[PDB]
Amino acid sequence: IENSAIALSGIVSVANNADNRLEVFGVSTDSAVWHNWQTAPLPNSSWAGWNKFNGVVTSKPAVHRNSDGRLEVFVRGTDNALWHNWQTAADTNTWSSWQPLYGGITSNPEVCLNSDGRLEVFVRGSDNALWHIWQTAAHTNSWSNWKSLGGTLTSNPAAHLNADGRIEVFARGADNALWHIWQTAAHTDQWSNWQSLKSVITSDPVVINNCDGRLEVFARGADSTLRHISQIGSDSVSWSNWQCLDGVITSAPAAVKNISGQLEVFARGADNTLWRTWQTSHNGPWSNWSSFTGIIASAPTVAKNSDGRIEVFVLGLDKALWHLWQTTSSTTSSWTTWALIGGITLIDASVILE
Amino acid sequence: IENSAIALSGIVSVANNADNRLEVFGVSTDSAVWHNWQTAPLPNSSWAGWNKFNGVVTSKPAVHRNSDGRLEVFVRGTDNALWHNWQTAADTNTWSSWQPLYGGITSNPEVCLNSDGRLEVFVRGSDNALWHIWQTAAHTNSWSNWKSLGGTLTSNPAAHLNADGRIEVFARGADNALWHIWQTAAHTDQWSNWQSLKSVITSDPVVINNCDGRLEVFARGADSTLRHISQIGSDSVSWSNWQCLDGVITSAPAAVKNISGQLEVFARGADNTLWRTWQTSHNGPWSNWSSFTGIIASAPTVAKNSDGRIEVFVLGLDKALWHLWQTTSSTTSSWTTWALIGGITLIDASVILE
Amino acid sequence: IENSAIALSGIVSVANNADNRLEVFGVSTDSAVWHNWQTAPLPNSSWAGWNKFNGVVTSKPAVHRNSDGRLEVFVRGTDNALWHNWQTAADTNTWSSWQPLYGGITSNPEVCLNSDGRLEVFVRGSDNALWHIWQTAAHTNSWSNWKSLGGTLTSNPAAHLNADGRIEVFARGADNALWHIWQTAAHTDQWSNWQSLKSVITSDPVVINNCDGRLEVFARGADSTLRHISQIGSDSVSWSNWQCLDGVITSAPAAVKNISGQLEVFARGADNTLWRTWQTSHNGPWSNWSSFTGIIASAPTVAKNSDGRIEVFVLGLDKALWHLWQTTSSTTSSWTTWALIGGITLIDASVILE
Amino acid sequence: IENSAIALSGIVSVANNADNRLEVFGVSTDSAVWHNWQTAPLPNSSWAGWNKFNGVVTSKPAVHRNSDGRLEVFVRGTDNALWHNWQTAADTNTWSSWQPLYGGITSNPEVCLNSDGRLEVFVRGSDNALWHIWQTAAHTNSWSNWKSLGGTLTSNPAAHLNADGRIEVFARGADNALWHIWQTAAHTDQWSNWQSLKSVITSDPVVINNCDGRLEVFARGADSTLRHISQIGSDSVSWSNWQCLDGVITSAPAAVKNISGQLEVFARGADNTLWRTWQTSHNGPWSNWSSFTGIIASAPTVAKNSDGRIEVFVLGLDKALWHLWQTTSSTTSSWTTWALIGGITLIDASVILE
Numbered sequence A, B, C, D: 001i002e003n004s005a006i007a008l009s010g011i012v013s014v015a016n017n018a019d020n021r022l023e024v025f026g027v028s029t030d031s032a033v034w035h036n037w038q039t040a041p042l043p044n045s046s047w048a049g050w051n052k053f054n055g056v057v058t059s060k061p062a063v064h065r066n067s068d069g070r071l072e073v074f075v076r077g078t079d080n081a082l083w084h085n086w087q088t089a090a091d092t093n094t095w096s097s098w099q100p101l102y103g104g105i106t107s108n109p110e111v112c113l114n115s116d117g118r119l120e121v122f123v124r125g126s127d128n129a130l131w132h133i134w135q136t137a138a139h140t141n142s143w144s145n146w147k148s149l150g151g152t153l154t155s156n157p158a159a160h161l162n163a164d165g166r167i168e169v170f171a172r173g174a175d176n177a178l179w180h181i182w183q184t185a186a187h188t189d190q191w192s193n194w195q196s197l198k199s200v201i202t203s204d205p206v207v208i209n210n211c212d213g214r215l216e217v218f219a220r221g222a223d224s225t226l227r228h229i230s231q232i233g234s235d236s237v238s239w240s241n242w243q244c245l246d247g248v249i250t251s252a253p254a255a256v257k258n259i260s261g262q263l264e265v266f267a268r269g270a271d272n273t274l275w276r277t278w279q280t281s282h283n284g285p286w287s288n289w290s291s292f293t294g295i296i297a298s299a300p301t302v303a304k305n306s307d308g309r310i311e312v313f314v315l316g317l318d319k320a321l322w323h324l325w326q327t328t329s330s331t332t333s334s335w336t337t338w339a340l341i342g343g344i345t346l347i348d349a350s351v352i353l354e
Ligand SMILES: C[C@@H]1O[C@@H](O)[C@@H](O)[C@H](O)[C@@H]1O
Pocket: A054, A055, A056, A057, A075, A076, A077, A078, A079, A083, A098
């Protein structure tokens, strides 16, 4: 691989409804967003069936739950502007249809929820800088004007809350290194300057929090292995060295915190199957990669059910959505084999960044 | 103290709104519930002022946020039945007024949110058993019939979710020991038998989860010191030995997990001031108690703000509500001194259990 | 029990030879020290048989291995002075016979090895102060003059090295609280003042180091349960609060670090059997006490074999020495039942402190 | 670098005497072993001066302390056989002179102390297999016959005790991967088969134990960065995945456990200065490399003083021995600058393995 490569992304975006039922959003061959949901919040639940949102889209959809429980989806439209669509009430399958937020978008959208309940969206703009727009009141369809945070982005952005409520945003820069920028006060339009975390990454960054608060960032490196870095202090400026794990991965990674508080990472492996690694103890060393049977055609998307059980979604070779899950709420649980969520086929609508 | 004593409780119940603004509920000299809220989700925010709910009540109010963000308050009425009252929309100060759930109540109510989004209420009944009632659909004013879980209670119940979504309930039994009972499958009406955790407690139990998932229970013991016990496995049946901490406390304890993932406990101390202890490292030993200036007249009630800062509420000697908070989002932060939330005086409406 | 009680002590002192074979020292009905040793450094080894040192003694013997591998035993004589006796070569059963160190002794002796290879002995003196005497060159029969460290002792002293090489000494004071005093520079005659750790203890203190360097002290408390306190910093002045564990113990405790780095404590329990508790995780909570069959008549003495397996020695109701051990080098290993090390009967020669 | 490279080694071997004074052994331009020692066991001590052992040698010397405190040095002679030389008494500068152990040696010797007090030596033999020879009684000049453990070695061996007393040996194999072999019972001539740990290493392996017992192995990888792997169970067969740390190193690494129980690694960095990294918390992430001023011409050799302070030895550009050390017994201590241990110049006598 080359330094500027961006690894294959997940094929759906997934959210938990207010009652924790999973709901997935993807793009079909008609270039429209379709969605499907569990009928009850357990991995062995039936799914409702694929339902279409009218409208042609030009990016992967991003979804987040509002602080009042309503899901809200963001996508790039045929006019290269940002559009969004929301449930009109929590846990209800009635939606607003696509409404305009304007702007000029050159990446997939990334959404975060501030700790004061306001959604905030991050995108690469037409000048390749990071731009953002936010709800001006919690869970309300009232939005700010577009504002630039500068920089030069060569990946999609990834945003996450610090333990103290400050949003921090990660993105690859013009030198193919990982850069970041952060709120200097929680849920406030006061931001740091851009700072480099130095390495060279060949996927979008993936960010998760560990239980002692500190952010941990995962990405594929220049040698196509997983690498990761962590905050070691109480601020956004103190980071560990980068560490890599042996084993060639062929997609973006996906990270999840299991119900024992340890981190797990899933990625497509060198043999195009799903690979999994987990921390063997608190902060501990990482297990050897363990592989699941079955060739997959996307990065994994990983979610947790209402009983803590991990569930993984992938694109199959038939271009349909498949999933598997843990049989018990236990870190050593066995796993099911791939099952089909049939009814449509999916395409990768990710914005091509170069 | 005697084995059957129940330590002084907190004077208000506190919840975070959907936008994380704190809101407190207490009972005034007119025997009505009054409430007050931050105008912005920061500890140095102004408060809106005390507002009254019409209706005479006969217990401490319990409050919980629904899975759609709406606060909902539960109280015993003049007819000894359960009543409730809810925000009609998230982050809005419009309420439904008191509506009946019937039953016969002989304790303060305790509320929990199941991991499928349904509130569930636990009370001691007229036969001294544990009874419960639940929403039949998430965040909906549709409730089940009353059902008994048996047992004999001599304290108020305390409920908490396990990491796998199973509710577990703790209460003092007829032998003054701590007993517990739990769902055997997440958010399902399938329950274990009662089991004893053995000791002798002289306060209501206080339950919190640590980051690696396991529940930890705090209570005052027969010698009037703090004691605690923790889950050591992945189920509800494997517990540590009881440990005590030196230092006489004169109220129920209040526990919180700070933004570094460590536990802290607050209680009124032997000199009637607020005392604080914290874990010095992960699972680590506990610090010596540290005292704050000022005599207090209730147990503390502890909450966290949108930026992670801890805030503590107490009854003052003037029978009004006072609070203090951390100056920074940091475990070593200094603290403010007590400030008044003036406008009404408060009474302790806790149900007298004997 | 009363605040000034001193719990029953162990009946033998145990050391590892240079080749790690265990060797035990006790006092028989002739008031002489006898010793016995493993013939190979494994718990299932045969023992050589009881051999006598000529000479009448008036205290429990203390034993330590010199930095050149030779064992050396310290005891009070019929003249109330300190006497000692050493192997003339490592792993050899040829001894020097008792030689005088003079002084006036009113406690059992306590021995420590400085990190520069010099033995140092701590005793209560005729004025009830702490006195000490040391080798002036490593593993050499050249000793200093007696010197006083002051204080007023009401227990035997317990000494241990800090991670930085500073000896720290613990002893009960005139107020029945635990006091301590320490070298302010490693292996130097420069000492702190006495400082109180506050509580009230009813046994000799027992001190061990945990793997992250910090000392942890165990003792029986005024309510006859185990209590413990730990260093929380990098110096001798920063300590945790005291914690107790439920369960009445009827002897001094004995602590050991197992080969997983976790602490275990053994003590005679309320039913006069051997009880064991262990840390369930790093610094973690403590397990419920687990009991072994068989009534015992002393505190346990605990040692580790060359393969890490823990072995416990006690006085039986027949006034003989019994032991049991782990069947495998594993923290969850099963244990053998009590086996006899027959040939003599033993008496408790501990100095009666009041 | 190429897969078969072996990184530059340390220029001296270092041991602690029985009284913990450091003593270093190196080879001078006369091809003889010389040694020098601290006069007192503190890093700021004067050194005695360089003293010569008569005899021409053809390998780097290996040194270990016997279980009776006497140092003993092993080296290859002009006849390609193993020779050794020992202190005749602990802490004494009287030595036996070189005595033969025969055999045919094609690597530097590696020495370990069994947990029953017997030294054991590991070497690559004339057939490129691993061979060993051992004391038949603890700290006694009585040795076994040579015995083969098979395999094919392409590095020097590194040996370490497991927590349960089993020796485990690590060495690079014919495929340039790290292999290992272990005693299946403590201090017994019963060994496992060879097993591969898979990667590709370009230095000798370096092995250390962490406080919870488990071995951790460090080595330079094929991309010239540090990599490491750890035991995750209670046996020798359960290992983590390999992890690398960013940063090009140009020598073998040297590892030490500091007095807080955390691991630190030193290596010559890409700019030919001394680099240091440390674990920021228990098992935690690794710090960025920190560099010391001064170009160095060997790998570091690292030791600990009697007060816990770390001291580092390197070859300077003047071909003399230099060292620096921590100013205080604290993980955050500042460091001195390089100081000269003058009197001879040193050569790298490491056996050239190909
Ligand atoms: C997603 C939206 O779908 C239709 O409404 C188009 O008219 C818009 O341009 C946008 O593409």
